[PDB]
Design a protein around this nucleic acid. Structure first.
Ligand SMILES: O=P(O)(O)O[C@H]1[C@H](OP(=O)(O)O)[C@@H](OP(=O)(O)O)[C@H](OP(=O)(O)O)[C@@H](OP(=O)(O)O)[C@H]1OP(=O)(O)O
Ligand SMILES: [Mg+2]
Ligand SMILES: [Zn+2]
Lengths: 550, 134, 171, 108, 204, 134
RNA sequence: GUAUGUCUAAAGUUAGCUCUUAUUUACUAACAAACUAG
């Protein structure tokens, strides 16, 4: 195999065929089915065999979908601008798999509006009147027959724009053309093993789309930026006036390094090829950075366990079919204390199937709608998800919000027991429209104590409701004197009554924890908090090196 | 689509073969139109036509629904391989060649073959549309 | 010409803000309800001019720029029915002491409300069923984020909600 | 059209102009507000003193309704053989009652 | 870092480093716009008299030089605009120059002092204001840009204020655990109001 | 020709009841469609000529448009005309520094095909591939 | 999860035993820890 690798041209000539360059790897060296054991169906094992064929085809996809084709008709993918050279099925399924949710468009639009921000950042430098966002066609991001102008610059004083040159030409001619109006057109292409030279491509598309007898652009002067997605490349061809060429060079290196749209593309090519090397910058929640939650910023939890809840019932023939009941999205702000409880009505699921993944995408849609309703001075500077599978839809629907620090967690935060609470269950089930019901979790809890006390109280109460439900409900509903006010959730206890309730809930949690896992006691304090609510070994090292130094 | 809208919306080799020959003819006529409008040169018309008649298997997609077209496609490729090395003795490599005559003959001989084929196929299809299935 | 319109509409500006909760459902009084919804937002901004010295001196000009279309579209009855009814529901829940949470609930019936799938997930997954087209919307009962300029004042409404919370809190 | 008539005067409390021919129209024993109208387009509409909450799980025209001791739940049966116990303003049935030999449950 | 197998670490017979000659290296910098570097390299005839060719391949009509070449790749080879002196673009410049030669509610709505006359478009994420070259002062996975305010250098955030107050609180919980059922109540989030009011009492 | 052109222009709406039998004619003309394609591509205009005014049969309903005549050319004249275009295209590949090949397909998928009388008939055609004969 | 199947007023046709209640067992579920169908 060593001489096979040396005979295919080393590692470079192998990986030029592959989709390695489209993935984001800091080095090549970090490149290196639990469903078949489930009783499902004799026929469904065919799809189980189908699954790794997809990653084999996607790994060799630039050399399978390449342009040196003896005979082959250039069809287009569904809803993206990837041109197949023949109806190859698994390649087409893998390219639907990566480029779902109009991610191609959510690349294109994103880059376009990010250039807008740069041109809104650099107005006075280039003497720009008004960077005009153009209302473009909804299918403009993949119409490759002809295009239009994404961004149109207007100028105050007219511009001495050059003859068309690349982004990286060292000598230009700032004398020739004279216009008061640039434009910009971001292009995207899935480059393959043959047609991946991006400068030739963007020069061909710029000299193609200006030079039509049909007119689409407001001026013949513009810059057409083309990003090659499948080879991590970029180039911009067109007319350059003074100060725009280093600006667009630095801007394209900045975008191509750190666009969240391009990086969700790279993450999907990584996870679609089942390869990963993780260096988690600003890590997930632990018992170490547990107070990273309400560090006086604006933030929201997103719980998505009870979005798609079901009730099953027998259905006249023997099968037990599965109806979708009214669900919730438990959006908790820990610091200020609101609760953007989204009530998902059954009319969300009008004739839809594969409701689980579609529920994850609907939860991401509602979080994006909630954030878009908020101002950009109340746009939450981080979002803590609760489940790992939430990260793939949410990082797409928050592509419009690059300010927001999407963080995973490694705490099983017991917000799934929200249906155990009576009034949350009432406002979940009693709905006609898909409603946004609000609460304060912290209702009697913000005249006396801050967010830390009662967030830990809420964690204790909700883990007790999730562990043993009606026992903790009888502990809440013990003293018939202490009632619940109409806009509160929890009973209006005094503080020693809250100490009694918290002590009984903690004893309930650890009682059923011992009666489930027959473990004696927590032999460590952070282990006990971790049991109530990777870096476990790091906090072992931290307490070993901090409890010894006294 | 549904599956019911994928069963009625699949069609045979006949309808698609009509569709691909009309793709071919429309490429021919649209390059002559791009000439006649004044956009493109006559030399660039001849190279565009010789590009059509030697990339029918790429520009159109007739190879899918009738595979003996590959014979003519191979012959067109083979005529390409002759003509680009008698047109370019002292010219090297590049577009500009537009001696489209024998590939044009090859596609006309293909049409000579599949006039009665398409007559019988589309006669059976159109009589299923009007008269119905026997 | 124009200064007589200034005189007339400022003498009308100084001539009620308490929205009758019968007049919210009373669709016949749509111009009067739209004018009251205009003038109570003017009263919010007049209060926020006064306490600007210690609460966000950077967003007052931005909200004045952003409500200019809503001030355009409320004085001469230029809005949608459900949009105006939900806005009046907000501004009626914005005049009561403890109804700030009900004010933001009315805001979240304004911003999203009745319509399921507000943005649209737009053909996720592989299979893309035939019913899977009705769960995306660019138009045809998708949201009321149908414009930059429209959503701009919709956002400014909850800016004034947050100011109303802070203003009734520290007084 | 569903009309709520006083037994003492006989005045107009509500006039429910509906879409379908309504089935039996019943009331929850706790509240005079809480008020359930069966339809024949497979739906049931709960009301107050004015729509409150729909009910759509029967496939056929709904024939007859009941409640529990002092209400707090609800019983529905249709031209299908199914009987569904719904709750106080909850769409989801606790039990749906069906076998292969049942004709229907037209009254109960 | 042996994720490399045995056969890749096994070198060829003569002389990790022998592979590193797309790049195998860094690959997280997105690659440059390289491009249209072009080159044009270069008996007798009965018809014209010139040497090299015969009458069957002469280029003048029968009377009684620079080449698109130096090719290795495919995208260089097709290249509809390979040679380029700007002819068609200057023609369209000339066509464009020929074509180039040829109310009160605004005043009513200034009752408040404005006398001026799918994402937000005013977001400007702090990688866009990081437009000058830094050593990745942003990550797009967590979508968290580092500053000196709530940022460190493997690292965490600055727990500022409330986070520092909970640092005081769980160090107080550790002090009450390392000083003083009750075996379980020694920690903060176990019995939170207990240690919260003990820390409130401690400030008296 | 204007009678033919008016028939083809009146069959762009095709929404009245009167087109019913005419629409029958369209589905019947598909099994005579591909023959007409050969009758285009035989009578395809050569590079030395601008536009070849050709005889053609049209159905009364304008269903199918069979180009009528067959292209007969004298054999030595035919190979001399194609050799003149051969030498002319060799000269205009050599002396031309940049050759621009056509776009394919020349029009968009959304664009309808253009009418001859409003866009092509009023523009005079260009100069064809002709060697300068001394 | 498909194939596929089924329902859907806008338009008005003339005069020992009965019982509550829990444990166990069996068959089923695209219900949970982004993808799999004849
Ligand atoms: O890839 P190559 O082996 O170098 O051959 C190519 C190829 O011809 P093939 O179809 O036989 O592979 C090109 O055809 P396409 O890539 O377009 O299908 C053709 O270019 P054109 O068809 O556009 O003319 C070109 O010929 P040339 O570049 O000389 O015009 C010719 O190169 P060779 O002449 O070296 O065989
Ligand atoms: Mg089968
Ligand atoms: Zn010679």
């Amino acid at each position: 195999r060593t001489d096979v690798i040396q005979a295919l041209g080393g590692i470079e000539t192998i990986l030029e065929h592959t989709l390695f360059k489209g993935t984001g790897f800091n080095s090549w060296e970090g490149l290196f089915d639990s469903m078949q054991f489930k009783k499902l169906t004799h026929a469904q094992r065919t799809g189980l065999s189908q699954i790794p064929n997809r990653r084999f085809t996607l790994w060799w996809s630039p050399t399978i979908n390449r342009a040196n084709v003896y005979v082959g008709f250039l069809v287009q993918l569904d809803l993206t601008g990837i041109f197949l050279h023949g109806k190859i099925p698994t390649l087409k399924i893998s390219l639907i798999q990566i480029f779902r949710a109009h991610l191609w468009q959510k690349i294109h639009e994103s880059i376009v509006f990010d250039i807008c921000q740069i041109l809104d950042g650099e107005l006075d430098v280039l003497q720009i009147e008004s960077v005009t966002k153009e209302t473009v066609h909804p299918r403009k991001s993949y119409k490759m027959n002809s295009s239009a102008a994404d961004i149109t610059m207007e100028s105050v004083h007219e511009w001495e724009v050059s003859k068309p040159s690349l982004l990286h030409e060292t000598n230009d001619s700032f004398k020739g053309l004279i216009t008061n109006k640039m434009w910009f057109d971001v292009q995207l292409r899935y480059g393959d093993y043959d047609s991946h030279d991006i400068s030739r491509y963007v020069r061909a598309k710029f000299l193609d789309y200006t030079t039509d007898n049909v007119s689409m652009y407001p001026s013949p002067t513009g810059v057409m930026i083309g990003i090659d997605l499948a080879y991590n490349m970029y180039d911009a061809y067109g007319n350059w006036f003074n100060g725009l060429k280093p600006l667009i060079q630095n801007s394209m290196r900045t975008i191509m390094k750190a666009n969240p749209a391009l990086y969700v593309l790279r993450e999907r090519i990584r996870k679609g090829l089942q390869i990963y090397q993780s260096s988690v910058q600003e890590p997930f929640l632990n018992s170490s950075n547990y107070a990273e939650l309400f560090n006086n910023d604006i933030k929201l939890f997103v719980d998505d366990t009870n979005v798609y809840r079901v009730t099953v019932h027998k259905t006249f023939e023997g099968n037990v079919a599965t109806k979708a009941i009214n669900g919730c999205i438990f959006t908790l702000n820990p610091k200020t204390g609101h609760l953007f409880l989204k009530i998902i009505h059954t009319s969300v699921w009008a004739g839809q199937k594969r409701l689980s993944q579609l529920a994850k995408w609907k939860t991401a849609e509602e979080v994006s709608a909630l954030v878009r309703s908020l101002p950009k001075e109340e746009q939450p500077k981080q979002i803590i998800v609760t489940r790992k599978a939430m990260l793939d839809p949410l990082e797409v629907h928050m592509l419009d919000f690059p300010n927001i620090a999407i963080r995973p967690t490694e705490l099983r935060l017991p917000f799934s027991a929200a249906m155990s609470i009576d009034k949350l269950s009432d406002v979940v089930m009693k709905a006609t429209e898909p409603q946004m019901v609000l609460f304060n979790i912290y209702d009697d809890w913000l005249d006396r104590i801050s967010s830390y006390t009662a967030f830990s109280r809420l964690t204790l109460l909700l883990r007790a409701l999730k562990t043993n439900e009606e026992s903790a409900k009888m502990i809440l509903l013990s003293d018939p004197t202490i009632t619940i006010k109409s806009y509160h959730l929890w009973p209006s206890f005094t503080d020693e009554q809250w100490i009694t309730i918290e002590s009984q809930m903690r004893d309930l949690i650890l009682t059923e924890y011992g009666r489930k896992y027959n473990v004696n006691i927590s032999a460590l304090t952070q282990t006990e908090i971790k049991d109530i609510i990777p870096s476990v070994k790091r906090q072992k090292m931290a307490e070993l090196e901090a409890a010894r130094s006294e | 689509l549904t599956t019911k809208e994928r069963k009625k919306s699949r069609l045979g080799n006949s309808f698609h073969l009509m569709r691909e020959l009309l793709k071919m003819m429309k490429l021919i006529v649209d390059t002559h139109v791009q000439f006649r409008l004044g956009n493109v040169d006559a030399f660039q018309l001849a190279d565009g036509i010789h590009y059509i008649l030697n990339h029918i298997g790429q520009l159109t997609g007739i190879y899918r629904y009738k595979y003996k077209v590959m014979h003519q496609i191979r012959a067109c490729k083979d005529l390409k391989h002759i003509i680009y090395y008698k047109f370019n003795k002292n010219l090297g490599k590049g577009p500009g060649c537009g001696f489209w005559q024998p590939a044009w003959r090859v596609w006309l001989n293909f049409l000579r073959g599949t006039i009665p084929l398409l007559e019988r196929y589309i006669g059976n299809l159109i009589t299923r549309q009007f008269e119905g299935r026997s | 010409n124009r200064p007589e319109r200034i005189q007339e509409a400022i003498a009308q500006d100084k001539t009620s803000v308490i929205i009758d909760p019968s007049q919210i459902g009373s669709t016949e009084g749509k111009p009067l309800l739209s004018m009251k919804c205009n003038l109570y937002i003017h009263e919010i901004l007049s209060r926020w001019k006064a306490s600007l010295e210690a609460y966000h001196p950077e967003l007052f000009l931005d909200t004045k720029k952003a409500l200019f279309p809503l001030l355009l579209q409320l004085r001469r009855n230029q809005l949608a029915p459900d949009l105006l009814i939900s806005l009046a529901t907000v501004l009626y829940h914005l005049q009561q002491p403890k109804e700030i949470n009900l004010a933001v609930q009315s805001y979240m019936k304004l911003s999203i409300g009745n319509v399921a799938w507000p943005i649209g997930v737009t053909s996720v997954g592989i299979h893309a069923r035939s019913a899977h087209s009705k769960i995306q919307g660019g138009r045809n009962a998708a949201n009321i984020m149908i414009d930059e300029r429209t959503r701009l004042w919709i956002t400014s409404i909850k800016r004034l909600i947050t100011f109303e919370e802070w203003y009734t809190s520290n007084h | 059209s569903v009309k709520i008539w006083d037994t003492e005067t006989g005045k107009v409390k509500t006039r429910l102009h509906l879409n379908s021919t309504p089935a039996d129209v019943e009331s929850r024993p706790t509240n005079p507000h809480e008020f359930i109208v069966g339809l024949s387009n497979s739906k049931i509409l709960h009301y107050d003193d004015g729509l409150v909450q729909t009910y759509d799980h029967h496939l056929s025209s709904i024939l007859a309704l009941k409640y529990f001791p002092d209400g707090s739940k609800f019983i529905s049966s249709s031209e299908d053989k199914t009987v569904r116990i719904w709750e106080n303003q909850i769409n989801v049935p606790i039990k749906q009652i069906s076998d292969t030999a049942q004709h229907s449950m037209p009254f109960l | 870092n042996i994720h490399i197998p045995r056969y890749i670490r096994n070198q060829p017979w003569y002389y990790l480093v022998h592979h590193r000659q797309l790049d195998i290296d860094n690959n997280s910098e997105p690659k440059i716009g390289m491009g249209i570097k072009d080159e044009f390299k270069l008996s007798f005839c009965r018809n014209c008299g010139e040497a090299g060719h015969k009458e069957k391949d002469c280029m003048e009509k029968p009377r009684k030089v620079l080449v698109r070449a130096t090719d290795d790749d495919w995208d260089s080879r097709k290249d509809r605009w390979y040679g380029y002196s700007g002819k068609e673009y200057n023609e369209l410049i000339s066509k464009w120059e020929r074509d180039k030669r040829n109310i009160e509610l605004m005043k009513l709505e200034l009752y408040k002092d404005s006398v001026g006359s799918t994402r937000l478009r005013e977001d400007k994420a702090a990688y866009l204001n990081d437009i000058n070259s830094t050593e990745s002062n942003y990550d797009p996975k967590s979508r968290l840009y580092k500053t000196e305010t709530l940022g460190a250098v493997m690292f965490r955030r600055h727990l500022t204020g409330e986070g520092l107050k909970l640092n005081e609180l769980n160090q107080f919980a550790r002090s009450h655990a390392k000083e003083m059922k009750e075996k379980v109540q020694h920690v903060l989030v176990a019995n939170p109001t207990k240690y919260e009011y003990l820390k409130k009492k401690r400030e008296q | 020709p204007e009678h033919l052109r008016k028939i083809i222009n009146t069959h762009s709406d095709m929404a009245s009841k009167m087109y019913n039998t005419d629409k029958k004619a369209f589905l019947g003309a598909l099994k005579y469609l591909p023959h007409a394609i050969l009758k285009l591509l035989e009578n395809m205009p050569h590079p030395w000529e601008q536009a070849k005014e050709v005889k053609v049969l049209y159905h009364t309903s304008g269903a199918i448009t069979f180009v009528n005549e067959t292209p007969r050319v004298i054999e030595p004249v035919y190979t001399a005309q194609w050799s003149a275009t051969w030498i002319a295209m060799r000269r205009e590949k050599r002396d031309r520094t940049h050759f621009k090949r056509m776009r394919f397909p020349p029009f968009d998928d959304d664009e309808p095909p253009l009418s001859y009388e409003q866009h092509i008939e009023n523009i005079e055609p260009l100069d064809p591939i002709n060697l300068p004969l001394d």
